[PDB]
Amino acid sequence: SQVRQNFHQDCEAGLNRTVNLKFHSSYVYLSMASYFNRDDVALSNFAKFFRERSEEEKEHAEKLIEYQNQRGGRVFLQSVEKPERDDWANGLEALQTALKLQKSVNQALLDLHAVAADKSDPHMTDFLESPYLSESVETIKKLGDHITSLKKLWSSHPGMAEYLFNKHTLG
Amino acid sequence: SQVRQNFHQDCEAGLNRTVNLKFHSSYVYLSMASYFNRDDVALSNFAKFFRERSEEEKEHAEKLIEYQNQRGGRVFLQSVEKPERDDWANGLEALQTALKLQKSVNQALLDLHAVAADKSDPHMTDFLESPYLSESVETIKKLGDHITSLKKLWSSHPGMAEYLFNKHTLG
Amino acid sequence: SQVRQNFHQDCEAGLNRTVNLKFHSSYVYLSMASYFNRDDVALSNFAKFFRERSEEEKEHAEKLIEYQNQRGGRVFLQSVEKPERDDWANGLEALQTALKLQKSVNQALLDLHAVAADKSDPHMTDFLESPYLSESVETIKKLGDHITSLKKLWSSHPGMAEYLFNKHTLG
Amino acid sequence: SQVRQNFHQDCEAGLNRTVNLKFHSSYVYLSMASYFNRDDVALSNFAKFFRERSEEEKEHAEKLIEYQNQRGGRVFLQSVEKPERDDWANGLEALQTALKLQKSVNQALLDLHAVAADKSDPHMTDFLESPYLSESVETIKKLGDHITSLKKLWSSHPGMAEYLFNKHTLG
């Protein structure tokens, strides 16, 4: 590419691997959103929350593809594996799964950042820091807070816990 | 000081002692605010409430310093002792601690007022009455009310108590 | 903490040490502001300037506490040592002291940044760079400029120097 | 008087004595204002400043007369002695004289307040506290500040001192 400069093959490859990860996360959130809209689950604000997370992950994936093109790298798309589950049990289990998902995506971004740093690519480390790394920790803190609040309510009554949380925290 | 008139040394000293007390209270509230923002506590409106109390105590301290200068007294700042605890247990314990703190600060203001009265300084007694003494009793009444409401909820479920109070009273 | 990830103990500790430093700086500036409001000093714009510096240092301290919570670290507050002096001599001596203070705080931020870099924490190095490190150098340059201008005037008449500078540069 | 209640003869008399004092102060300030408007003095902002002080003292005198009537006391006006000087030397000497005048008026208000307190008249002590006692200390602090600033300039050149102060502080 006539545009390529100081762009290492490992960074190009890591980038392609990361967009797949982001699409997979988006897909997991979409599954969760759909689950909460089921007539036998009916937690509309949990659904809304996960739907928003889904769209955010999707937009990140698209921005990474755009970054690949900007640097003169070549995009290679892979199949997107379906979520690990189709039933997410309940609001608390879904939140806990999301925290685990967010931390694995954060680790992937940190690993990619380390590759860019090792290859001395300041443009890429800068790109990864904001907003990718920053949004990750913000989301992780938010999910941790949510889990704590829901757990407090859970100890009294799980049925009422989900209903009240859906209304007061997610509404 | 060319400006000094009817300003007794004991009032000057009491004033310096009181600004330290006010800074210490501010610091205690800041500690509480930070505690409620912890991911494992997550009561944002309790945090907000204590953050506001912190700023109010800080502004009072600054107004007392300003009063010292106005009367021709000389400000002497002392080290600000850290809060007695770093962990505040829960919303109810924090509220009860704040009531105790507010009453000790109120007593200090009453003692200072008595010194000013004894020395026949009507400018200072007037200054202390509004808004210092008035805000103290208003805050004390507010905290007493809060404690009563939270205790009512506590008897059912502490987890749900803090969650509901954080949302409905402090939100 | 369920939220903690890639957050080293040394960074957590350095953070707690830095908030204390920031509170101490705020306290030093407050002392200076109060000194310039004395009837026998009477340089209102110097007071205003240091009052603003005080509030800025305080807000930085609070943002660092907030950052600690975001990463899953635990805040530990220590006593805030009183300023080294209660009398700041004059406008020039105060400015020179502030430059020295700013450079020591800058060094602390640089040392903390180095710890974060050593531990491979890109989220923290990024956080420290803007606005902390950037504001430091901006403030340092501003103070250096002020000192130079005041020194030019000082050589003629210190009394007139402070009066004119208070009005034209700080006003 | 059908309206009189808890109004002691000594308070009534002190009130009449104080309105005369206030008229005399107003007259002194008027003399100063006129002096600074002389073609051979020509400090328009010093004149403006003293003119304002004159009007303030006059309005206080009128409010005290009004208070006398409100309580059922009877107003007795006495001759207003002319100022002690017709020539006020310079801006610094005038400022120093005003500080001395303000402190003597403040003492008179404090003495009157003490009489009201001794006679258990809370309506009168309250009336005297705001705005009379409060304005006195504010004015005293302001004059002390002004004197300090002008003295700083005086040490360099008195001619330039008055000119610059007239423009920058009083303008």
Side-chain angles (χ1 to χ4, degrees):
Chain A
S1 170
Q2 66 192 332
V3 146
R4 198 178 184 132
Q5 184 175 18
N6 196 40
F7 196 45
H8 197 97
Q9 162 204 359
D10 292 1
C11 295
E12 178 178 10
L15 214 41
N16 281 329
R17 178 205 61 63
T18 308
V19 351
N20 191 254
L21 212 213
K22 281 293 186 178
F23 278 132
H24 180 68
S25 297
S26 184
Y27 209 19
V28 171
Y29 280 124
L30 177 67
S31 177
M32 285 178 193
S34 306
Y35 175 80
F36 289 100
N37 274 329
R38 284 166 52 161
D39 72 272
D40 60 340
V41 180
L43 291 167
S44 64
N45 294 139
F46 268 83
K48 178 205 88 292
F49 178 68
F50 292 128
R51 186 87 56 167
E52 294 173 347
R53 289 301 310 141
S54 183
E55 285 303 297
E56 265 291 294
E57 296 303 285
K58 181 215 66 177
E59 80 166 37
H60 283 188
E62 296 184 346
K63 284 181 288 190
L64 296 169
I65 286 179
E66 185 177 288
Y67 183 78
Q68 182 75 278
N69 270 334
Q70 182 187 56
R71 295 297 303 278
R74 295 293 171 247
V75 184
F76 281 97
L77 299 173
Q78 249 308 324
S79 298
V80 183
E81 181 64 47
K82 65 192 217 65
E84 297 54 54
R85 301 205 282 161
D86 281 285
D87 186 288
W88 301 97
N90 54 243
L92 183 62
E93 190 151 321
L95 250 30
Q96 288 171 329
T97 299
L99 181 65
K100 287 174 299 192
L101 177 63
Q102 290 296 147
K103 295 177 79 170
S104 59
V105 173
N106 187 42
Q107 190 57 66
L109 293 176
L110 288 171
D111 290 349
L112 188 55
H113 187 283
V115 170
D118 185 56
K119 304 304 170 181
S120 290
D121 189 335
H123 189 267
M124 194 171 170
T125 52
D126 182 69
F127 172 80
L128 256 21
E129 281 156 22
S130 280
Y132 311 95
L133 258 28
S134 43
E135 97 81 66
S136 284
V137 335
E138 287 181 34
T139 299
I140 288 171
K141 176 59 165 64
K142 185 191 204 295
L143 289 174
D145 288 348
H146 284 353
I147 290 165
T148 292
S149 303
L150 190 49
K151 280 185 176 177
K152 282 191 211 282
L153 294 173
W154 213 261
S155 40
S156 305
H157 288 109
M160 201 161 67
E162 293 182 306
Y163 181 87
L164 293 174
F165 191 85
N166 175 252
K167 179 68 185 187
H168 301 132
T169 299
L170 269 25
Chain B
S1 170
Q2 66 192 332
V3 146
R4 198 178 184 132
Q5 184 175 18
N6 196 40
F7 196 45
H8 197 97
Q9 162 204 359
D10 292 1
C11 295
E12 178 178 10
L15 214 41
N16 281 329
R17 178 205 61 63
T18 308
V19 351
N20 191 254
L21 212 213
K22 281 293 186 178
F23 278 132
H24 180 68
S25 297
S26 184
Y27 209 19
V28 171
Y29 280 124
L30 177 67
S31 177
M32 285 178 193
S34 306
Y35 175 80
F36 289 100
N37 274 329
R38 284 166 52 161
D39 72 272
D40 60 340
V41 180
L43 291 167
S44 64
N45 294 139
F46 268 83
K48 178 205 88 292
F49 178 68
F50 292 128
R51 186 87 56 167
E52 294 173 347
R53 289 301 310 141
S54 183
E55 285 303 297
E56 265 291 294
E57 296 303 285
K58 181 215 66 177
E59 80 166 37
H60 283 188
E62 296 184 346
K63 284 181 288 190
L64 296 169
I65 286 179
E66 185 177 288
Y67 183 78
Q68 182 75 278
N69 270 334
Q70 182 187 56
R71 295 297 303 278
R74 295 293 171 247
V75 184
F76 281 97
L77 299 173
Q78 249 308 324
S79 298
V80 183
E81 181 64 47
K82 65 192 217 65
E84 297 54 54
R85 301 205 282 161
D86 281 285
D87 186 288
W88 301 97
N90 54 243
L92 183 62
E93 190 151 321
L95 250 30
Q96 288 171 329
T97 299
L99 181 65
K100 287 174 299 192
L101 177 63
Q102 290 296 147
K103 295 177 79 170
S104 59
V105 173
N106 187 42
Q107 190 57 66
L109 293 176
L110 288 171
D111 290 349
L112 188 55
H113 187 283
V115 170
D118 185 56
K119 304 304 170 181
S120 290
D121 189 335
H123 189 267
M124 194 171 170
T125 52
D126 182 69
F127 172 80
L128 256 21
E129 281 156 22
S130 280
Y132 311 95
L133 258 28
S134 43
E135 97 81 66
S136 284
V137 335
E138 287 181 34
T139 299
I140 288 171
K141 176 59 165 64
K142 185 191 204 295
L143 289 174
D145 288 348
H146 284 353
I147 290 165
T148 292
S149 303
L150 190 49
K151 280 185 176 177
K152 282 191 211 282
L153 294 173
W154 213 261
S155 40
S156 305
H157 288 109
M160 201 161 67
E162 293 182 306
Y163 181 87
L164 293 174
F165 191 85
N166 175 252
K167 179 68 185 187
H168 301 132
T169 299
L170 269 25
Chain C
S1 170
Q2 66 192 332
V3 146
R4 198 178 184 132
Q5 184 175 18
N6 196 40
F7 196 45
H8 197 97
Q9 162 204 359
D10 292 1
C11 295
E12 178 178 10
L15 214 41
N16 281 329
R17 178 205 61 63
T18 308
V19 351
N20 191 254
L21 212 213
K22 281 293 186 178
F23 278 132
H24 180 68
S25 297
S26 184
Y27 209 19
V28 171
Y29 280 124
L30 177 67
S31 177
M32 285 178 193
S34 306
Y35 175 80
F36 289 100
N37 274 329
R38 284 166 52 161
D39 72 272
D40 60 340
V41 180
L43 291 167
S44 64
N45 294 139
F46 268 83
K48 178 205 88 292
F49 178 68
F50 292 128
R51 186 87 56 167
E52 294 173 347
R53 289 301 310 141
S54 183
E55 285 303 297
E56 265 291 294
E57 296 303 285
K58 181 215 66 177
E59 80 166 37
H60 283 188
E62 296 184 346
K63 284 181 288 190
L64 296 169
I65 286 179
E66 185 177 288
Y67 183 78
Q68 182 75 278
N69 270 334
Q70 182 187 56
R71 295 297 303 278
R74 295 293 171 247
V75 184
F76 281 97
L77 299 173
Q78 249 308 324
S79 298
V80 183
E81 181 64 47
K82 65 192 217 65
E84 297 54 54
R85 301 205 282 161
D86 281 285
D87 186 288
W88 301 97
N90 54 243
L92 183 62
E93 190 151 321
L95 250 30
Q96 288 171 329
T97 299
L99 181 65
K100 287 174 299 192
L101 177 63
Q102 290 296 147
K103 295 177 79 170
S104 59
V105 173
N106 187 42
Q107 190 57 66
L109 293 176
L110 288 171
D111 290 349
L112 188 55
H113 187 283
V115 170
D118 185 56
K119 304 304 170 181
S120 290
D121 189 335
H123 189 267
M124 194 171 170
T125 52
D126 182 69
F127 172 80
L128 256 21
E129 281 156 22
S130 280
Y132 311 95
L133 258 28
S134 43
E135 97 81 66
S136 284
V137 335
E138 287 181 34
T139 299
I140 288 171
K141 176 59 165 64
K142 185 191 204 295
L143 289 174
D145 288 348
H146 284 353
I147 290 165
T148 292
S149 303
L150 190 49
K151 280 185 176 177
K152 282 191 211 282
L153 294 173
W154 213 261
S155 40
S156 305
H157 288 109
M160 201 161 67
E162 293 182 306
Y163 181 87
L164 293 174
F165 191 85
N166 175 252
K167 179 68 185 187
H168 301 132
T169 299
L170 269 25
Chain D
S1 170
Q2 66 192 332
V3 146
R4 198 178 184 132
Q5 184 175 18
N6 196 40
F7 196 45
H8 197 97
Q9 162 204 359
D10 292 1
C11 295
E12 178 178 10
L15 214 41
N16 281 329
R17 178 205 61 63
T18 308
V19 351
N20 191 254
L21 212 213
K22 281 293 186 178
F23 278 132
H24 180 68
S25 297
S26 184
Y27 209 19
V28 171
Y29 280 124
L30 177 67
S31 177
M32 285 178 193
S34 306
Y35 175 80
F36 289 100
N37 274 329
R38 284 166 52 161
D39 72 272
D40 60 340
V41 180
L43 291 167
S44 64
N45 294 139
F46 268 83
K48 178 205 88 292
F49 178 68
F50 292 128
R51 186 87 56 167
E52 294 173 347
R53 289 301 310 141
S54 183
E55 285 303 297
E56 265 291 294
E57 296 303 285
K58 181 215 66 177
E59 80 166 37
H60 283 188
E62 296 184 346
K63 284 181 288 190
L64 296 169
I65 286 179
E66 185 177 288
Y67 183 78
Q68 182 75 278
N69 270 334
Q70 182 187 56
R71 295 297 303 278
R74 295 293 171 247
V75 184
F76 281 97
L77 299 173
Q78 249 308 324
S79 298
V80 183
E81 181 64 47
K82 65 192 217 65
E84 297 54 54
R85 301 205 282 161
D86 281 285
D87 186 288
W88 301 97
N90 54 243
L92 183 62
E93 190 151 321
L95 250 30
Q96 288 171 329
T97 299
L99 181 65
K100 287 174 299 192
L101 177 63
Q102 290 296 147
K103 295 177 79 170
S104 59
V105 173
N106 187 42
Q107 190 57 66
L109 293 176
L110 288 171
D111 290 349
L112 188 55
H113 187 283
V115 170
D118 185 56
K119 304 304 170 181
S120 290
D121 189 335
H123 189 267
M124 194 171 170
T125 52
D126 182 69
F127 172 80
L128 256 21
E129 281 156 22
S130 280
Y132 311 95
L133 258 28
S134 43
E135 97 81 66
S136 284
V137 335
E138 287 181 34
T139 299
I140 288 171
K141 176 59 165 64
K142 185 191 204 295
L143 289 174
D145 288 348
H146 284 353
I147 290 165
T148 292
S149 303
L150 190 49
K151 280 185 176 177
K152 282 191 211 282
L153 294 173
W154 213 261
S155 40
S156 305
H157 288 109
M160 201 161 67
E162 293 182 306
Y163 181 87
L164 293 174
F165 191 85
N166 175 252
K167 179 68 185 187
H168 301 132
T169 299
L170 269 25

